Amino acid sequence: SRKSTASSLLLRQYRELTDPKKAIPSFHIELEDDSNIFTWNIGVMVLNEDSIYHGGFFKAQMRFPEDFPFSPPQFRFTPAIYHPNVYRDGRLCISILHQSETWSPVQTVESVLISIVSLLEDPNINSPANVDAAVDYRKNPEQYKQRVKMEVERSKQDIPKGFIMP
Ligand SMILES: [Zn+2]
Ligand SMILES: [Zn+2]
Ligand SMILES: [Zn+2]
Ligand SMILES: [Zn+2]
């Protein structure tokens, strides 16, 4: 009921983010089991040539509550990546997904995803989920860069067969 309303709202956004003319090339969107509208498997791409993340295909899972959009989704990198705002188990800590800028019911999946790729490139080192990565980011940029490069290379193993990287 609230679940029914949430599922219709999520389907509308899913269709926008997967319709050939509305899709955003940075984000490859699928549903869990090709049918669960409340759990999306997302491939995050960093199209900015400047980024140490460029060329990766970072798999993640976005889980939506049954009262969406009145509560935020959760977002987990699968596998975890080395980033100041990513917990060791892959959970992303980002202000737009905190209740109650924090989450609001006018936020969309598109706005969250945009915020996430922005945070990849510009981490919040003042509120770090991974203090090791936060320290490396500012004090050991070459160490940080080499760790991210390794993870970029690892991530290419998750590019689905047939998928055409943007
Ligand atoms: Zn796909
Ligand atoms: Zn390129
Ligand atoms: Zn948090
Ligand atoms: Zn270190």
Numbering used by the authors: 3 to 102, 113 to 178
Paper text:
Additionally, Cdc34 contains unique structural features that are crucial for efficient polyUb chain extension through poorly understood mechanisms, including an acidic loop insertion proximal to the active site and a long C-terminal extension.
To investigate potential Cdc34 conformational changes that accompany Uba1 binding, a 1.7 Å structure of ScCdc34Δdist alone, Cdc34apo, was determined. Comparison of Cdc34apo and Cdc34E1-bound reveals two conformational changes that accompany Uba1 binding, both within E1-interacting regions. When bound to Uba1, this extended region of hA melts but remains ordered and projects away from the helix. The second conformational change occurs on the opposite side of the E2, where hC of Cdc34apo (hCapo) is extended N-terminally by one residue and sits at a different angle compared to hCE1-bound. Modeling Cdc34apo onto the Uba1–Cdc34 complex reveals a mechanistic role for Cdc34 conformational changes that accompany Uba1 binding (middle). Second, the extension and altered angle of hCapo positions Val143 such that it clashes with the SCCH, whereas Cdc34E1-bound Val143 is shifted away from the SCCH and makes productive contacts with Uba1 Asn694 and Phe695 (and 5b, right).
